[PDB]
């Protein structure tokens, strides 16, 4: 069965000869289908003008605490909390 084959995004598969496989002979090995790494990758990097932007990730008090991210560096800048991505250029 594929359930006990899938690689958890955390990065675990029971070895092919590992007795802890036995626990799934009769129950499914739940593995989630949304991997945050892929999803945030898909989200495009927002861009702004000001040297310093602010993110709360979510909205109002439904997101993470307000954080200010400077963009003067050439590259992207990833929000510490939500993983949103910023680029000033």
Partner 1 sequence: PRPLKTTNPAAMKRGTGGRSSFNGIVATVFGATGFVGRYVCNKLGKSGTQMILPYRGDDSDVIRLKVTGDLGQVLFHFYNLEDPASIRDAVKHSNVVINLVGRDFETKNFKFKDVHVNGAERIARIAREAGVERFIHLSSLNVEANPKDLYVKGGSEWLKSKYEGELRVRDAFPNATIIRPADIYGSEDRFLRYYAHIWRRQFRSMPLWHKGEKTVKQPVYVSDVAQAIINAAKDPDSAGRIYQAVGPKRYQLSELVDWFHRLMRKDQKRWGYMRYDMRWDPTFLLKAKLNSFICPGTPIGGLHPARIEREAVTDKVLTGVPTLEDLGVTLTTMEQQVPWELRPYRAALYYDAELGEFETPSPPKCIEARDELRLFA
Bind-site residues:
55, 64, 79, 82
Binding mask 56-75 for Zn ion (x = CB under 5 A): -x------------------
Q: Phi and psi at residue 22, in whole multiples of 5°? A: -60, -30
User: Residue 44 class from Cβ within 10 Å (0-12 exposed, 13-18 middle, 19+ buried)?
Assistant: exposed
Q: Does residue 17 bind partner 1 (CB under 8 A)?
A: yes
Q: Does residue 22 bind partner 1 (CB under 8 A)?
A: yes
**Cβ pair 69, 79 in contact under 8 A:** yes
Q: Kindly state the smallest distance separating residue 79's Cβ from Zn ion, in Å.
A: 3
């Amino acid at each position: 069965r594929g359930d006990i084959e899938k690689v958890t995004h955390t990065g675990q598969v029971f070895d092919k000869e590992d007795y802890r496989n036995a626990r799934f002979v009769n129950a499914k090995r739940y593995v989630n289908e949304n991997w945050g790494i892929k999803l945030i990758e898909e989200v495009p990097p927002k861009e702004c003008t000001e040297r310093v932007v602010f993110c709360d990730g979510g909205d109002g008090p439904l997101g993470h605490p307000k954080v200010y991210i400077n963009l003067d560096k050439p590259g992207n800048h990833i929000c510490g909390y939500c993983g949103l991505r910023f680029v000033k250029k």
